[PDB]
Amino acid sequence: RSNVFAVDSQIPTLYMPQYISLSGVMTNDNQAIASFEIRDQYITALNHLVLSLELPEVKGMGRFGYVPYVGYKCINHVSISSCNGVIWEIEGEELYNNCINNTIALKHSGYSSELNDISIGLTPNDTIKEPSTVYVYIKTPFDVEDTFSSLKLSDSKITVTVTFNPVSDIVIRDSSFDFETFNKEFVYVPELSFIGYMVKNVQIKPSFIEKPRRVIGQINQPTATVTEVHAATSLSVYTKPYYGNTDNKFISYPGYSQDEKDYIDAYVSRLLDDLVIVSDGPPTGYPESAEIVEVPEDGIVSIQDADVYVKIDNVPDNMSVYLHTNLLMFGTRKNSFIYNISKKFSAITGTYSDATKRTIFAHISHSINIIDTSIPVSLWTSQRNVYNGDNRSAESKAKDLFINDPFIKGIDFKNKTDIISRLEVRFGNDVLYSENGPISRIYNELLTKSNNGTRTLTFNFTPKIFFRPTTITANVSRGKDKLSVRVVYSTMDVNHPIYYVQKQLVVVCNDLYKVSYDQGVSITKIM
Amino acid sequence: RSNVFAVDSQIPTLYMPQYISLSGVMTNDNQAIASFEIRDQYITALNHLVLSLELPEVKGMGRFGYVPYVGYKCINHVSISSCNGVIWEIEGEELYNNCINNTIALKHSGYSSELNDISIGLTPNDTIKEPSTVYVYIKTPFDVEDTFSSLKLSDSKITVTVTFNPVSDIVIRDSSFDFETFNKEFVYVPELSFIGYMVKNVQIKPSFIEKPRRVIGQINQPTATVTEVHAATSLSVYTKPYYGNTDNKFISYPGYSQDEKDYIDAYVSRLLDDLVIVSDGPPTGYPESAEIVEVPEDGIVSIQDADVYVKIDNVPDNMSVYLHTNLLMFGTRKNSFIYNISKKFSAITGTYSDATKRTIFAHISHSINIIDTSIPVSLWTSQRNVYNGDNRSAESKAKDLFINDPFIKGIDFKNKTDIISRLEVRFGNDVLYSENGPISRIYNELLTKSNNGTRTLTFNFTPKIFFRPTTITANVSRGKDKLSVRVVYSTMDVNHPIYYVQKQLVVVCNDLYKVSYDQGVSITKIM
Amino acid sequence: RSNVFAVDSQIPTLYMPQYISLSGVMTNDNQAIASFEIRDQYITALNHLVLSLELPEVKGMGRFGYVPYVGYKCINHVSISSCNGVIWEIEGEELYNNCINNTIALKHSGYSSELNDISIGLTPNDTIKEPSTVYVYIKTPFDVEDTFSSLKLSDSKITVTVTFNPVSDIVIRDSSFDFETFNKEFVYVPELSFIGYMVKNVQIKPSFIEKPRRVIGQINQPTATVTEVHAATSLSVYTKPYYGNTDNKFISYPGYSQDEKDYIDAYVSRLLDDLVIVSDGPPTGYPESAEIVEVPEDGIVSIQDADVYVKIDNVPDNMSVYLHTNLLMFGTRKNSFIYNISKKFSAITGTYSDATKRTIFAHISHSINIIDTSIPVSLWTSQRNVYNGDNRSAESKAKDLFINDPFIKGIDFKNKTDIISRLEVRFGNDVLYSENGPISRIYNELLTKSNNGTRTLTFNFTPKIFFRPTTITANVSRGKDKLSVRVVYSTMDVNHPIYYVQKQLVVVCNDLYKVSYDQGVSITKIM
Amino acid sequence: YSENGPISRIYNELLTKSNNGTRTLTFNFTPKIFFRPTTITANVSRGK
């Protein structure tokens, strides 16, 4: 019988860990680059890299806030090199995707009301935001099995290089803020930390590492190809929107609250102030194409099949209630279907306030959705629209927000709508996999215990470090050495504005490399 | 010294995985049965079964919604067989209990506002719900240790059989919905997926598997017995309510919000509209036994020791405020204690709205609880009640909801009240365990890291796959081969309606089986 | 090739577990001590200790509630001994810190609205709280590796001793409650449970255990020293506030809601009733130093550079709106800076209610923070304050609350502000580590997956039970046998009241011990 | 086999010299009567 009530305690290698901190050299649209040099013959191994960033004080007038997870979204590229060349590198988006399921890292990276609330400044000497510091955990393959997986520095020099995104990407602002001055006087201040191990009489053996590789397809094309595939462990596919042909302005943004319900409530709250107006006589200051009608005594206004129920309490006797019946409208033919935001409301109740001269709304019933909240403003007024699209007031038009978040997926802010209806993967010339529904995404989320998975084919099911990984292997004789992907996009109604948002296909492939430790660190591609 | 900075990488067996999808055959109260046939000599092993289901479009008038986790609650039975007979089977409730701690699986199975909100239809051509698809992860013993635990198909035919519950169980509806037509036209559409492994020169060895077995006791009896117990790893006990002697109608249901506070708020909100009435003269349309009194100037109404504080703002000068002092009442003797829902309120404030002709309530102080929210409507008006129980208006009575959820535990919707005060377990003739408090439930939750544990005795503490499991073993000579359970139910007040809800005892025992792989797959009970 | 599709099932040692429960002996400011005796020659091992506590019924008048996690916060000290002396002991605070990341244990220990809401009693026979029971999971080193790590009772007697805190520490109450009677009649009722293992022909081997050791520094001194350090695995540092020179009264407490936003909202809600007053003529009943001014027609009141915007609807025609412009004020010089809570508000809106004769506030904009919510009341009126600090009404002063929570860290209730700006650790005479930012706290939280880490140096990275732990080792020849810590506290503004809160430094060191099993259990310090 | 456009119909019409072909997969290209026809053959072991 095997003893399950006692073990023989082994004596491990003698070692001692130490926390080490390093400052870097900054060089320069003058993109910023930081280089860190690690040189000590007693540092045998290292892992758990952490980058710190100091954000400065912001003063002035206007409305201003930071995007969520600013620390992660400010990183463009990370590279680790030695004298024999690059050992490992990754783009920022792949790091974000790999760390998306680590709530503690996300919270440390910068997620709070003080940072993400949309603050207001009244005078040129008002302080909008106080200074603070964020920390970005750079997860690497060397962390998966603590000491067993650490990187051994066989008496070589290691260089870490971090490239930063321009500061315009991480800021949410309105047109009143003095962005040119802010951008001229903003500077990045970084610092790198890691855990080192001092080892006595180490015995080194070769090991194995995986390197991700990204390919971006052409605009609106439904194909992409990865060449020189000799040993891959997985393949991932997703899409990105391209907003380069707009001015990047949006009607609303919820800030710290990030639920779907919060997005919808913020949008509806921004529209309600202009949708129902209490005025003495016909309201002035609107474009000529506005159709503002008076609410009857029974409270029901008909807008061609749609009925809106409006009841306001405490209305002064010298005033009346009016309804804006075409706040935003879009159509491609003069007598075809019309997308009209006014017809998405069914009941509106509230009470007028004499002290503040505005209406305080109570219960609202509506059918607004995330696509409506995600339509960009500039598409409402494009040349293909035969109507005047934006019938809002100037005060409302002055509150639009610039949003330049670089890691948006799908065609909406939450990646909720699935726009891929069929996927087909070919390895060489033969079909390797085809599916209609998102069963591969379901399987990815189940196996990785994540809420934000993507369509992924996984080929390796063996434990990571103690076994050689299982791969799909090339056959250059028959020509099986490339993976081509083809999708069919869903069909949308030609009268919905979201139909004209352009998109790009993204394919990610994980290649296998061999690590040898004679003459320092070097890698060789497995063939 | 043992090296903790390097390992020897072993070469694993050569294999290649593949995702496989299969369609099934449907046969037929004409209970639906699906059969799936797996036949390929190169599929050596499989695991991670996933079932997909397509839910259709629902049109018409009335109020309609789906129960939470509809995908799990639609499954009655799953069986896996070969030519030598059954290999593994389980009922739906045991699967649900085993998967209750997997948040990602639960969310995939169907949990969202679009599915679980109580929608309203106005015309016979209104679309209440759009079509969608859910996925049910069928967790099996073959998943616990990836490749090591997979099921080996030694050149045999494998059949999977799924039995479905009738559609009436998964729908929450009011009496206005045309359920007979919906039930006549509804059809199940299923599809099975799994991960297969193509292995080269496999070397097979025998292994071990555990099979659950459920016993259901007689109505209201506090005993149950499991026969033929020769090697069991655990024992579980819980209770179920039986609502078969009612019409299954309830006053309220919160829908997507599933907190205790949400249940209580929905119930209170449904009662408040009928509890306090603002009217010009005595309200009409109520049964003769109603006692509706006028609120005095100081705002305090006395109902025999209980005092209710009522203050309403903006009351028109031609109207008064009335209070319904016996909305729901129950008692067994003419002059004994009375359970009166009106006496559970202490303060009610709000403001009357002239535009909508209703009262908008603000702050409420009350002592309603989950048992009150869980009492079925038909028990308020049973024959043993000497009063007229339901003094609500017809409009309120028309809003009751049918609820037929099949996996309810305890006597309330959240299984919060503990109605078992003492438990005694006998193995053979001798007492094996006895307890007063729920220390076994505490231990179960601690050891399995679950929030919804049950009273469970665990006999196996060894690692699952690499060791033979530890069991309790029979001694047929002394006659130790059966487990009998006896409980004592808590004592409730004879004047509470919940006292008359019937219940059933459920016992679950996990038996051990041996798996051999010569002549395909076969099992033999360990004796 | 190694087989990854099959294993050889080993046969384990024959054993059988059993749940055992014991009652204890109580002895006696007459601090309570419980002793439990374990004596059975067939109990070979044990782990998973659980303590249960019965809380009694509380009746009377006033406001009363329990602190969160009362079960954990009621424990002062736990000790485990045999005939050879103490085997393991720990203070309550170290246990709480070790278990802080176990949500299920925390929830079982007593965390609910019924326990933690601030209830109100109206008559001397009112029932404020019903009786209930809590359970405290006493996590020990013997649990980390189930059967492998269990404690072997080599035919010796084991004694467990639990010391309890006085009941005044676990209760939150106002001055109206009859605490002297409650404290005279309260009694502790405990019971211990554990899992025992009956083993046949056990084969015992020696093992390894770690014992924590706490040192508390002197008041306001920034140094502390641990002597006799021969083999330590880690070192931790944090600070505690000392409230012994006050009366322990606070303005508000949120109860069950424990977010920062909840603290701030409760504080603001308590202040708003006294900050803005609607009255017929100048309000009476305030001290002579109050400066109450009338709000002009434009609604803007200036308080030296600060502007407050006040708009109240539905004000009766015989009444006016007044603003209290110096509710709480503190300063050290007659014409220097003043901390004035009235200047932290920028906009206040609401509606007066005629029925209840009070103002119902709607939207509030403010800059109150957690330090303001955490300032104790007695510091507002200290002798060093040259103004009259507390200008509230007597009714408001009668609602203050006593709070005596014993496990508060930092200087605020959430330990959010970091008051340590530099840390330096010396081992012997030489500097072992120094840092400016909290990178060690970041690393602690990352490595232990916790949200509430402390500044910790970790020296052991090897797996716990199967390897001998790595330690830092003394060199008595050079005199390296002591660890001295020195901090520099942050600098605060001399006109903020929080500057005068006293603090204490706490250092925790984990020493290594050897366990041998000949002649029962005994330990010997590794040298 | 999988296809998007009607290339199989084009091939059917080309090979049979017809104006009204359908989507057809042809497996036999040998002369009809003097040779045994070429077929696609089952593999009941793998279940094809």
Residue numbers in the entry:
A (entry chain O), B (entry chain N), C (entry chain M): 18 to 45, 49 to 547
D (entry chain P): 453 to 500
From the article:
The 62-kDa D13 protein exists as trimers both in vivo and in vitro, and structures of the recombinantly expressed D13 trimer have been determined by X-ray crystallography.
To investigate intertrimeric interactions in the context of higher-order assembly, tubular assembly products of the N-terminal truncation mutant D1318-548 were subjected to cryo-EM and helical reconstruction. A 3D reconstruction at 7.3 Å resolution exhibited a continuous honeycomb-shaped lattice rolled into a tube. The structure exhibits two alternating modes of intertrimer arrangements, which are mostly stabilized by electrostatic interactions and agree with the self-assembly behavior of D13 with varying salt concentrations of the buffer solution. The first mode (mode I) is similar to the doublet structure in which the interaction between the head domains appears most extensive between the EFH and CDH loops. The second mode (mode II) also implicates two intertrimer interfaces. Symmetric Y62-R498 interactions were no longer found in the base-to-base interface of the mode II arrangement. Variability of the intertrimer torsion angle and direction found in the helical assembly suggests a possible continuous curvature in all directions, inducing the spherical morphology observed in authentic VACV IV.
